[PDB]
Structure formats: structure tokens, C-alpha cells
From a paper:
TphC belongs to the TTT family in Commamonas sp. strain E6 and through biochemical and structural analysis, the ligand-binding properties and 3D structure were determined in both open and ligand-bound closed forms. As with the tripartite ATP-independent periplasmic (TRAP) class of SBP-dependent transporters, they are symporter proteins driven by an electrochemical ion-gradient, rather than ATP as per the SBP-dependent class of ABC transporters. This analysis demonstrates the narrow ligand specificity of TphC towards aromatic para-substituted dicarboxylates, such as TPA and closely related analogues.
Residues (P28-D37, PFSAGGTAD) map to the motif [P∗-F-X-A-G∗-G∗-X-X-D∗] which is highly conserved in TTT-SBPs (conserved residues underlined). Superposition of the open and closed TphC structures highlights an ~36° closure between the two domains upon TPA binding. Overlaying the open and closed TphC structures indicates the movement of the upper domain (α4–α6). TphC shows a 36.3° closure angle, whereas previously resolved apo- and ligand-bound structures of Bug27 reported a closure angle of 24.7°51 and other periplasmic binding proteins show closure angles ranging from 15° to 60°58.
Residue numbers in the entry:
A (entry chain A): 21 to 314
B (entry chain B), D (entry chain F), E (entry chain D): 20 to 312
C (entry chain E), F (entry chain C): 21 to 312
Write the structure that this text describes.
Amino acid sequence: NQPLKIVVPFSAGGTADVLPRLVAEKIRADYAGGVIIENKPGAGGNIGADLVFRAPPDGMTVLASPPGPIAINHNLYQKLSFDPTRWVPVTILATVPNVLVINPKLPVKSLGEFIAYAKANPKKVTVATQGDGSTSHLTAAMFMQLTGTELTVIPYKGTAPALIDLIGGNVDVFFDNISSSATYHQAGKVRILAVADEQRSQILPQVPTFAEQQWPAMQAVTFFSVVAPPGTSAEIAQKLQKQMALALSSNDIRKHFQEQGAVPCGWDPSKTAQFIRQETEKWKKVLKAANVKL
Amino acid sequence: SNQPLKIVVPFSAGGTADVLPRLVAEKIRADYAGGVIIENKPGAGGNIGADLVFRAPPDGMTVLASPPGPIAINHNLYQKLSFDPTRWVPVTILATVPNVLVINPKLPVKSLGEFIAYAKANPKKVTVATQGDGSTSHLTAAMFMQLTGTELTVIPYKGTAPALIDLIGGNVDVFFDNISSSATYHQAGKVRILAVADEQRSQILPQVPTFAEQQWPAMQAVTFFSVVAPPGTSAEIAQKLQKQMALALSSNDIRKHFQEQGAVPCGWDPSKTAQFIRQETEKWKKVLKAANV
Amino acid sequence: NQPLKIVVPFSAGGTADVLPRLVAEKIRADYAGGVIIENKPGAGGNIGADLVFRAPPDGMTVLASPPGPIAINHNLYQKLSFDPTRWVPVTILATVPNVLVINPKLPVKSLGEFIAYAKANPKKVTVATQGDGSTSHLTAAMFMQLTGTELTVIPYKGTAPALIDLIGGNVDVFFDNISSSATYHQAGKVRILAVADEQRSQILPQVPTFAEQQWPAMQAVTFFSVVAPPGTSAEIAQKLQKQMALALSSNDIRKHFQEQGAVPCGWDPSKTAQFIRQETEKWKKVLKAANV
Amino acid sequence: SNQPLKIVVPFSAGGTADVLPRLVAEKIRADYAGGVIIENKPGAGGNIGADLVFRAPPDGMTVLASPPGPIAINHNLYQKLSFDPTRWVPVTILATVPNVLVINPKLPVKSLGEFIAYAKANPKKVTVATQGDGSTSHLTAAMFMQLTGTELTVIPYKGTAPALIDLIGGNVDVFFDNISSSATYHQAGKVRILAVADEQRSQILPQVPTFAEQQWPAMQAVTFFSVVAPPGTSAEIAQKLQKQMALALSSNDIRKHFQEQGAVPCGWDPSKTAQFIRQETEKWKKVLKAANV
Amino acid sequence: SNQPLKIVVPFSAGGTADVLPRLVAEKIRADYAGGVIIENKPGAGGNIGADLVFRAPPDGMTVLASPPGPIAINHNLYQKLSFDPTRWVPVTILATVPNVLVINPKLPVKSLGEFIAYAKANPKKVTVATQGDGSTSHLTAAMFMQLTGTELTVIPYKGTAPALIDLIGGNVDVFFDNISSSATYHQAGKVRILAVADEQRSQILPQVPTFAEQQWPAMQAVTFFSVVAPPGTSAEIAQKLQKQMALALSSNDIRKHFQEQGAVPCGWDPSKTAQFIRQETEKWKKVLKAANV
Amino acid sequence: NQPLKIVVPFSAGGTADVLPRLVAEKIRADYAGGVIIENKPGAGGNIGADLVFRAPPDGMTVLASPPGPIAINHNLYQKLSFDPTRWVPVTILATVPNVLVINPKLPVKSLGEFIAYAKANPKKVTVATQGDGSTSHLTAAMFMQLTGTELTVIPYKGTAPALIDLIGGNVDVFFDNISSSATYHQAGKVRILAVADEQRSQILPQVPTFAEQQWPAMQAVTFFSVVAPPGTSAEIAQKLQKQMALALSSNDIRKHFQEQGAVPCGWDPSKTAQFIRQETEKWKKVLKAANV
């Protein structure tokens, strides 16, 4: 019969695309018609999100996305064609931590010294972002708010131009995801001072968390969710989450996740909904205190 | 006709954009039995007020007195406008006010030449205050960056006051302000004006040299205040109004009140006004393009 | 040597402030101590009115005000600290006319067609106001009572949001003052169909009056009055009116008035007193009927 | 020179502090080929604007026009200032506006004498409104207390408007306001002004007696408006500007406009101006001392 | 114990607010040797009658039976009240009556979903009747707009009756009425009820769906009828009365009579009641803030 | 072995100093190196707080303070060198309640009549404070906000001048702590009408709480906390809390605390952390609404 269709509201290739396709190959065994993955990029995930939001609530069309259209965009975009608060949560596939990365020529050797250095030179230290609302912008804003520091933003079109400047010393700080920066940290081109998560990342087992360094409130991960259209029954959503939780349990899948810097979750629909609710409220505070609404 | 002339200033009352046309209105009231009405119609960088004039009857009884936004910039700056600035019927240029290079005094530089070299040795390390993308201070800083081969990191501010606060405090390094705003802080040692981006020095600060005197004649960045009439206004009607305004601008007391705003009267004829507006439009179009704003 | 004091019971900047300050420049010559103008806004003019109503009736403290505390508010507010029927009238400085403004998409191109259109579609045409008792509401109610038309009232918190909706086609008609709507008419964003005054306004010389379109009774202007405290002698009022009528005669001040959309008047105290009584009874009637 | 004169008023536009210098400015524009600029630089009781002139060149092309705060008060009120008001070069005194004793009408006293007796018979029972320690209404009330040996309980307010609300409403008993602010409420019976703290009566209220008339000549408390120039300004330069402003202050229209603000023009020469400021500085420094104990 | 219980209904006799407590009164008379008085004390949206109970002795012999105005709404709607609803001692919720979305039948939509899409595609073009700011129909309209991100133009009316006349006559487009009022007109085809803002359908019109089952479960807007006691009434006294009323609400005759008003009996205990009132209070406080700027 | 160091960010001799020292003597048996108490006064407790906020987070340096640097000062001072939200809570040692004190000449005998007397005469009743931010100011504002009464604020440089005027009838009410006003209440020089706590104070057993007079939301106590530097493990905080809870359980500690008007608490670190957040948000709201 009918295949399950999973819409990733981003282009193919990245972690946003890799993780749902990995899961798809495992649950293909549960669907007689198969599993279609489609990439529908545009407007921070809002174009692809709208196509699932309007689809029939039978659990045969779902959206697999990082937090944009799930938890952020209704507080970032002045107007949306859909309400993320009406999504039917299915599960959280995984999380990927963000990290504090610095150019090595900054005269600091620790997180604490870097905070003192920024406090003593307000607005003199520059921080790279991917534009207003981007994960790296929001994480820098959370960091600034928690630590009482003021960093001067420099927006970049992509991760690659940001790192080129970070390595060259033309921008001082960057709140990147661990998978992007690890290789440059290992080669000494940049320095990762802390991971904004509850545990360290096995990509860089020696890099400590913010929490180990007296900053447990600094929690900033990119979480990959599966949501169903409004009106999807709790039963249908449970059945799919349990298919995906079983898919996420094998060992090869967990390795392929770790290779993206991602830890599998597979929480039930109730924990998923509570997590999205908490993350939504967290970033709303950050956006408001930073006065960011595009 | 006993119908008053109406002048729309597409910005809030007070400020140079409002002062200069109201000064001129006092004089040309003698030319209008029904008088002269000045209205302030702020909104959207001047576009809201511009649009109200753009759609008015082309009889020369409704004109727009505005700085360059809806005259020569916003159609290259905004995604989409409800009007086309290239179809304005030019009347005259009322005045120009020059922008200047202002630096925080802590910068280890004594001259424009040393500042330029300092910025070159430290790409993106020197910060520049702006009033947002497209504002005169952003466009002036972009022109400077493009001419001199330097890279300054932009910090946008909501108004001029918060930007000067940070400049005096050392939280931002540079600001391309207008001479009138920064003069008092320069005289007090709170900031340092290094160069006026104009053809002549400003009498506000007779000792501050231009960029052109310091090996940079291309750095020319003034705010010009124009009068324009709706599309289809005859050249005869436009020239009659320009001659009235030109006579207004020749009084000595009007020129003093202009100088007190940092402004130099112009009053050029519609042909030279149209040519100036085309030159400035293309100048800033190239600057916006190179900066990709 | 004591200066004349003129209290304007409204904030600085608007026409209520401009016109008495223009007259003040001219009559400073009759007062060795000068002329003070104070703005005392609050409660639709009532706060400032109360301050003058309690002042000594020697002619050295006057209220210059639009109609609210002069002719309307005692029939609008449930209680006032002053009685507008005891004001000692000095003069009417000027009038500014109200106008009939429509969204341009209404399938009507004249006053006559608009009245007919509303007749054939009772309650289908909506009219913006600024609350009950506001000038746009009273003028709308008068229009309905004279033409026997039925308009559905949509209230707004101010003129700016009303005009936004009128221009956007979310409300159909608005009875504005001429100086507010003129620029939007010239821009084609609205259409003024008629001026509720005896003569056309020189701001929009081609816009006809109600009177020349067979509705002379539709007379709705904001008048700017000067009044003195209770018990001010008739002679003291006459003397002040003469000073102000002389101030209103120069060309320059009359032109500055027209720039506000205002025609200078300067009527003597007897004609001013009769005018205010007529206006007072007119708006009382309009209120009663609209409130039914 | 073609450089304009700059007058900094270290307060917001629109009040008496701004109105009086602006009136003088228009009259002396004829003396300056470059015109006269007036800027409003508010902040910190006048010290922000004051500092900007104190640091400007002492050529007489930048001067401060201000009420007494940064001229005679604030170095004895604030802990640390960036400038020493005793080093100002005085130019002239533009005008004075007197402060007055205003009471709630329900107080069972009809005259200043009866009020002073009433406060004596009920120490600390009569409450007095202020705008905070150091404000004119506070210093004037403290002078009154020290002179008459009375004790009033001090209730501070954020500004004049809420103080007057409470005075009219009987929530505070007394207020030492300036005559211009309270006159309309006195005329309406909402308050009663008992005495003007000046050498002569105010023509706004010709029937209100002075403290002097009622055997208290020492109660002299006016807001005086000064023009001062930066340290190092020559006596000759200060004299030249004072003579220009004296001529402006002698005209009859200036007189009337000043009176409409409750102000009387002065225009004293720089030597009398300096002596007046020294005396007021000592007076208010003495009052601040006794008050803080 | 020989004193009658007194129930004050702060509205006029005749309506649901009067019917439901009077039905309950007939059953609980068995518990009061002196009987049960019901008084109607209308005025100021319930605040006059509420004040009379709020000030009564907290012995449980005087209670207020009221819809939400003076229980959960008015202290966030009126600028000031003589009493604080958050200090009421809750007893029980007697019943809920749901509000519904009612449209003129000429609107080119046949379902809630089509209506929402139509409004979003024509912002401010669809008009909505209310009974003034703060009225139940206005608050329910504002909640609908905030949840759905739609914009409706508000037309206020003096009461329900003129609103329905205009709705039926096509002079206003939508009205958020209570089910009991619109049902007959829906059945006659003079209006179309599209959805009920409640957890379950109303038996008045079993075929009309809820917002919830059409994917809008957050659209929950009912008129709830509460019994509250004066501040300081012991929890025990409140429990005793709630238990008496819950027993009355379980009788078959009373439930039927409640359904005839469009009301569902509740009878919750004082703790669940207090929770619901807090939730509803916060709910409408948010709607009021987001609505009035 | 290294002593435990307790920094009290206020001068010796007051209740803030007495209570931690009493506890220290009881926990000296748990520390082979002893227990040091230091007084580091200055800037409302901020100077001494800063010295602990920067100390090694090993449980050997702790701050024992009233609420200023624990829950208030970041919402009151423009900038602090530390962030109170990052303190690692240990325990609440004790609370001391504030009370409503009036001059005996007010024509009221109860809290009820006082609230009514002020409602009927807004702004006529005056209230003494120690300046904006002081506990007497914050408690007065909370009262005003909860009861919708309006009192006119008279500030004083300290408690003693305020009591002089309260007794003298130059100010009408004062929200003092129980220990300061009790003696004057017993002498009839003031009248305490209500204690802003959950239970009555044994210093004045006959004086009722706000809560038993139908105002339980009126809870205003000075609480004395122990906090550890940021990053102090929860285990270290728990060990210290358990030591202080034992010290707080002795009857002789109860008595010495009561003699200060204090009741021992000794709650675990989780309840302590919850309490501090509740009090922080409480007084943040009071400040906001007060400054408007």
C-alpha cells in the first residue's frame, strides 16, 4: 500500500538530511509501500514545513527537521503560514552540541579567562554567525546573556567563510557545532573551549562541557525532530515513534549518528513534546532579550 | 489661485530635513496668496511621504522636500517601492551637509593616513557605527571601505545618540557622522574628526581638512536636500518654483540659518538639479552593489 | 503691567495651539506685560477649562479652545466641574470644516450617488469614528439624521488608524476635518465628496460644499473660541474681542490661518454668544438622537 | 571668522532654560557672520552639557547658557565632577525667575507671618514637597527652614507635576515652586502663593507680596540663567559677548517674552556677573551644609 | 443556623445567570432551616453585586453566584475595582455554557477551515460583532484572532439583539455568541454556526462540531458559572456548601433543566474549582493584553 | 586542616552577624581547622559577596547574608561584579518578619480599619522608608500593591530617625522588622497591627499575622541565607547544609534566634533554592510596579 513520506525541509547532504534517511532505511521494513524521503528547502525550513503542516493527519506524511520550523521560527519570523505549537510531536531523533570556538591568538587559555577578557573589552571581541536567528547567532546571544558579555556580531553566508576568518584571526569567536570545528581544533587552527551540553562529545573526549566549567545553564544543542500534521492521533504518532525508536537502537545506526556528532534519542511522544516546549520557551527568552525578529 | 502650496517632508518634524524647507517656506509665502503648508509624513525611510506626493496632481502645488532616501537611493536599496524615483520631476537642490570620518580618541593613529594603514594591518578588527543597512552612515562607510581597500566591522545602532555614546566610550572605533552632529564632541576632545568628505571645509570646524586635501579626492559623501514634483509636472512649472526658491535661498539670513544646520545653500536650476541627482544615484548604486546590501 | 494669559486646554502643536499663538503675537502690543500661552491638556479640555472658569473675571485670564469645553462636554460627560453656559464669550477666532471622506472603491462618485447608495443599502456602508461624542461621530450622526441614511459605526482610537482602514477598504466612510484628509485626497488614496461648510475650502478648491449640492443644513465645523470667566463684564470682553479682531485683519495672519485649513472670523461678543448657543443646541439634538 | 557661535543649553528644549538663550541668540545673530547655533545637551543635572563646553577652546565661540546647577551648585552637591565651576569665565546673567511659597489652601493660615508661626507651633507637622535633595525646591525650602527656624517634613517627588497634584489634593502642605509654574493654580484657587522670594514683586501676580515686604529680606531665592565661557577665555572676549547680549536684552520685545516666562532680564557686565555667582555659590553651599546635618 | 443562606446573583433576573443558582437553591433548602434567599443586584458588569458579597461576613451564609466577570476578568479589564477577585474563596463551578462561531450565511465558506483561510486571505475585511471591549463576545473574538493569526474588523453593539439583527441582515459578518442564543437562528438558516469552542459538542445542536475536533483544541471559550464566598471563609465551610450543591447538581431534573439553558453541570470540589478559575483568569488576562495593544 | 570561612557582608553586632556566629560554634566540631567568621561590609553586601563569589568552589568559603546580595541587588543596582543567580544555595538559616507599625493617633484599631481608612483617603496616610530599595520601602510597596491602597512615601536615612517621627506623629506608618519596633509597641509609642509572616511572633504573641486577617499573600520577611561560590558541587552544599541543620535543631539555638526575632529554618538545598527564586521574583515584581 501507500509509502510513508518524510519531508526534510532542507537541502540534501547535511546532517539534517543524513539522520532521517538512516532511520528511513530501518523502518522501510515496517511499510509495505516503502519510505520516501524528499528535500524541500526554503526560508529557514518554512516552505517544506508548510507542505507537511497541510497534509492529511494520517501519519503517512511527516516532517523531519532541526529546530527552525519546530521551535524557533514563530518567534523569529514576524509572520508564518503555520503554527509550530500545533505540530503533533512524534520523537526527537538526535541532538548535536554547539561549542565555543576561538581563534588561537586570543590571549586566553580557558573559558573563564575568555569571559574576563570579553568583560574587560565590551564589544571589542567579534563573534561570527550565520545571520540573525541562526543557531550560531542564538547560541552566542544565550552565551552573552548568561555571562554578561557583549560580543560584536559578524554575519557570514555559510560556515565555510566563517571558519576562514576565524582561522585567519579576522573574527575572534564562533559558536559552531562540534562536528564542523573538530578537525580544525585537532590541527590547532582554532581552539574549542567548551561544549554546550550535559555530557562531552566523543568526537573530542578531552574537550569539557560548559557545565564542568561552572556554567551549567549553557545548554545549546541542535535537536532533530519528527512531527506530524495537526490532528494526527496520539495513537498514530506513538506507533511511528516506536518504529523509529527500534530503528535507533541498532549499533550501526548509532555509529553513523556519532559520525555526524549526533547522539540518538528516540524519546516517546510525551517526553518529545515536553522537550520541544522547554526548548521553545528557552529560545523565545533569548530572542526577546536580544531584540531579534526578522 | 488662493490654493496654498503644500510641501511634504517625509520625515518627522525637527531636524535638518524639516528645518531647511520651513525656512524656505517663510520666504516664498510672498509668492502664494493662499500660503504654504508644510506637512511631516514620516515612515519607511521616506517612502510613505514620497508616495503621497508621487501620486499627487502634477500642477506644482504639491512637492516633496527630502534628503536622498526616496530621491536617489531607496529604489536601489529596497526590494520593491510603490513609486519610481527616476520619474520625479526635479525642482532644485536646497542644500548639502557633509559627512565626516570620526574616530574614538584612543585609536593609536594621528592622521587619516595612519588610520587607513592601521585598518589595513588589522582587517575587520576596527569597528564602525552605522544607523542600519542603507543609512547614510552605512553607505558612507562602505564608500570609504571600497575606495581605501579597508575592511571595517559594522555595528548598527538605532539612532545617532547611542552610536556617539559608544564612540566616546571606546566600544566602537569609527563613525561616518554628519559634521553638525559630531562638531561639539570634536571640540570637547571626546572624538576626533579626521576628514570632511566634501569639496570644501565646513565653517562649523574651519580647521578640519577634507579628504581631498589629504590625497583622497574621490571620498565625496554629502547629504543633499532636494525638492521634487510629481511625474508629469511641466518644466515651466518646475522652473517657476525653483526660481522662487532660489530667490529665497539668496537672502543673507537664510544662508546663516542654513550654516547653523551645517548646510550650504545651493538652489541650482532644474537641469543641474537633475544631473546632480543622476550622478548621486549612480554613485550610491555602485556602492550598494559592491557591498551587496 | 500684568501679562494676558491664554490657556489652551490641549497639547502644543495642533491647530488649537497654533491659532491663539498667532493671535498672541499681534496683541502683545496692547499688553505691556506680554501675553502668556499655556497648554493644559486633559479630559477633552475639561482640566484646562476648569482652571480658567475659576480664575478672576478681570479679562486677564481667558480660555482659547475648540468646542468641547465650550459647547459640547456638558451634554457629553456625566458631570463637569464647570458650567459652559456661564462662560463670558469674547470671540470666535476661526472655523475649520469637516468633510465627507470615502474609500475610493465605493461605487459612487458624488455626494448625491453616495446618499442614494446608502439609501438602497441601509447599514451596508460603514463609517469610522473616534468614539461616541467625538467630532467624527457627531458629524456622522448629523449626516444620518439629515439625509435619513443608515451607516454602521466602527470606532477607532484615533485619526491615524481610521485613515489606515479607510484607505485599505476596511471601513467605507469617515467624516474628517479638511486639513487631515486633504493630502490623502490629492494622492487618490481617499475621496472627499463634500465640505460641510458655507463656502469651499481653498485647500481643495474643486471639492464642493454640501450646501451647493442641496444640503445647506449639513454645517459641521470645528470652531475655535475665546471665553472669559463667569462674571467678566461685557465691556472687558468687548475690549478683548476688538484687540483680537484687529489681530485677525492683517494679511500674514490670515494666510497662516488658511494654512491650518482655518478661516478667520473675529465676530463680536454678541454674535459669538448666539453662535455658541446655536451650536450647543445643534449638537445636543444630534447626541440625543444618536443615543437612541 | 565665519565660524558660528555655539550656545549649549545643558537641558532639554522647550523650557525656560531653552527659551531665554534662544531669544537672545536671534538678536545677536547680526553680530556673527556665521550665525549662532543653539544645542540642547541634557543629562545629569546639566553636567553632561556643561562638560562639553568646559572642554571646548577658550576662544569665545563656544559658551554654556544654563540655570544654576553646573554654574554654582553641583560641585557642592555631587561628590565628583569632571569640571570645576569656579573656573568658568563668566559672561553675563541673562535673567532671573523667582521662587515662591505655595501652600495647600486648607492650611489654617492666611499670610506668610501666620504660616511661619503655624510651623513654629507644630514642628515637623507641616510637610513640604521637593524634587529631591539638591533640587531648587529643596534648597529653597531648606533656606526657608534655616532662616525662620522652622522644621518641615520633606516629601520628595519625581517632578513638578506630581508635586502640584499632591499639593492641590492636600497630600502635601507646602511647595517652594517657581512663580511661572504655580501662577495659574493660584489664580484658580487650587493653591495659595504666600510670598515671592525676590527683591520685587512679579508682574505675573502683582498682588502677591515679596518675603522682603513682610520683614524677611534675607529670603532671596531665584533661578538665575548664566552665560559662561571655557577656562582661559580672555576678559576681552567675555566682555565683547556680554555687550552684545546686553544690547539684545535691552529691547522691549525681549523684555515681554522674558516676562511671559516669569523672567526679568539682567545683562550685567562680567565683573558684576562673577560677583553675583560667587555670592550665590556661597549662599547655596551654606544651605547645603546645614541641610545635610 | 436559623438564618437563611443568601445567594446574590450580580445580574438581572430571568437569564441563565439567574436560572442556574435558583434551580440549585431549591435542592439545598433542605440543608438550611431558615431557607435560601436569592437576590439580583445588577450593575457595572457584576461589580456592584460582587462588592456586596465581598464585604459580607465570611461565615458561608452569604455567597455570590456569578458568570466570570467579577470572578476572573474584571480586575484585568476595569482600571480599578473595590475588591480583588483573586481573594474570593472558591466554592464550586455550577455549569459551563459554550460560545460558538456564528457567521452570516452569505459568506462564501462552509466550514471553520474555509472561514479561517478566507479571513487570513482578506485581513480586516471580515467584520465581527461584539458587545463592547471586555464583553464575552469580544474576548472570544480576540482569542480566535490570536490563536489563528487572523484580523477581523470589530463592530460593537449595545446588546446581543441588535448584533443578531445585523448578522442576519448581512451588515456584520461574524459573531462569537453563546450556543443558547444563536441555536434557533442557526436552525432557521438565518445564520450558520461553524464550531463550538468547547471540549465536546453541545446537545442543543448535536451536529455542530467543536473547534477541537477541527484541529483547534486551544479554542476553549465557555461562560462558567461560579459560587464564591467572602475572603476569609474557612475551607471547611466552603467544602460543606460545595458538597450540598454537588448533590443538587446530580439530580436528574436539575441536569435536564441545565441542559435546557445550554449548560452542562459541573459541581467540582473547591480545589479543582480554584485551579480552573486561576487558569481561566490567566487565559483571559493574556487575551486582554494582546488585544489592547 | 583548613578552617571553614564564613563571610558576613555586613558589620559585626547585628542580626546578620549574630545568627551565623551562633551556628558556627555549633559546627566547629565538624571542622578540624575551626570556623572563621569575617565581616566584610560595604555597598549593601556587594563588596563581601564579591569576595566569596570569586572564591574556590570547594565548600570552604561561604557567604552568610540577608537577602540583598542573594535575591535583590541585581534588580536594584545598575551593575554588579557578580550574578546572584549563579550562587549555589546551601540553606536558609532563619527568617525575621516585617510588620505594619502605625502612629497611635491614627483613628484605627485593626489592620482592617487601616486598609479601609487608607482606601477612603488615598495619599493622606504617609509611610516612612529607608529609601528606594530598602526593605521598609519594598514591604510598603508590596502592601500597597496587594491592597490597592495609596500611601505617600517619606524617606529617612535610617531606622532611628523614622521611629522618632512615627512616635512623634510626623509620619503615619512604617513597615519595620519585629525586633526593632517591639519595645516601642509595648510602651504604647507605636501600634503594630499585623505581622507579615505565616505564624505569629512569640516576641508579641497577641499581635496577629496578615494571614489570619485575610491577607495571607502579604509575606515579607528578612531571610538569612548561606550560599557557596558558583560551581560548588551539590554534594558539598548538601554536606554543609546537613551540618547546619543539626546545629539549628538545638533548643538553645532556637532561643538565641528567637531573642533576635528569628525562627530557625535549616531547609535542604533544593527547598532553599526554590525559596530564593520565589523571593527573587516576588521582589523583582514589587520593584517594577513601584518604579512606575
